[PDB]
Amino acid sequence: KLHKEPATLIKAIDGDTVKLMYKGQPMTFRLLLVDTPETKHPKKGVEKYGPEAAAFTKKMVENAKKIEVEFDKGQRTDKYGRGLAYIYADGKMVNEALVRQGLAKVAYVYKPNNTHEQHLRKSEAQAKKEKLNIWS
């Protein structure tokens, strides 16, 4: 069973990345299963809807009382050292909130880190139907 653990915000970095204090250590976290347009893209730079996704993530974590992280059942870090997790702001998953708003797509999935995949894909289908942001 997945479990939520507490964490403390340090800094929001981009739509898809936040730095948190986790078990008393600063760590960078990549949000599992979503791809946001980025402000810090390796090659493109500032993509379309990137500032918007970045502001949404930032506001959501900065205004939270409680941040929780939930790892999935497979690897917990990626090749850059970033934690791979679902992030919750007052009980609300940030990963899902971004997809539901049309500010992220469901990413290419890699088993077994796929526990909330069907849920996110359902939110994404709804955002596409509503033609929100990325889908407008």
C-beta of residue 95 within 8 angstroms of C-beta of residue 124? no
* Annotated binding residues for Ca(2+): 16, 35-36
- The total domain count for the chain is 1
* Torsion of the alpha carbons at 100, 113, 83 and 1, rounded to the nearest 10: 90
At what resolution in Å was this solved?
A: 1.6
Active-site residue (options: 30, 52, 96, 100): 30
Q: Is 100 a catalytic residue?
A: no
- Looking at the DSSP bridge assignments, the partners of residue 44 are none
The H helix count followed by the E strand count for the chain is 3, 8
User: β-pairing, 4-14 with 67-71?
Assistant: antiparallel
Active site (annotated) includes residue 76: no
- Per the structure, the complete domain to which residue 96 belongs is given by 1-136
Amino acid at 38: E
Q: Is 121 a catalytic residue?
A: no
User: Could you tell me whether strands 25-31 and 83-89 are parallel, antiparallel, or unpaired per DSSP bridges?
Assistant: parallel
**Which residue of the set 52, 68, 82, 124 is catalytic?**
82
Catalytic pick from 38, 52, 96, 124?
38
Q: What are the φ/ψ torsions at residue 31 (nearest 5 degrees)?
A: -75, 125
Please list, in sequence order, all residues whose beta carbon lies within 8 angstroms of the beta carbon of residue 55, skipping any fewer than 6 positions away.
none
Structure-determination technique? X-ray
User: In this structure, what token pair is assigned to residue 122?
Assistant: 């359902």
Which distant-in-sequence residues (6+ apart) come within 8 Å of 86 by Cβ?
2, 31, 32, 33, 69, 70, 72, 93, 94, 95, 116
CATH of the domain at 110: 2.40.50.90
d(CA 82, CA 85): 9
